[PDB]
């Protein structure tokens, strides 16, 4: 019940980058703190929310066709 998506995407400044990996995963690495979460997510009508197994869960949505709205972030593709 996942729907992968594969991309790096990354704050508008570049403090923290969050790559989605190949098998629909995800994996952020943020300034001093790499490898800092990494889990799976789930893609509801742009809809999206992070199911950690370590006990952790987020929510977000696709605002737009390169830009990402989770935890009231701003997570754009690549850049």
Do not use: C
Request: hydrophobic fraction near 30%; avoid cysteine; aromatic fraction near 14%.
């Amino acid at each position: 019940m996942q729907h992968p998506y594969v991309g790096i995407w990354v704050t508008a400044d570049g403090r923290i980058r969050q790559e989605l990996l190949p098998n629909g995963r995800y994996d952020e690495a943020r300034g001093n703190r790499k490898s800092a979460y990494q889990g799976r997510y789930e893609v509801r009508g742009a809809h999206i929310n992070y199911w950690d197994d370590t006990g952790f869960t987020a929510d977000g949505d696709f605002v737009s066709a390169n830009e990402l709205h989770h935890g009231g972030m701003t997570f754009y593709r690549e850049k």
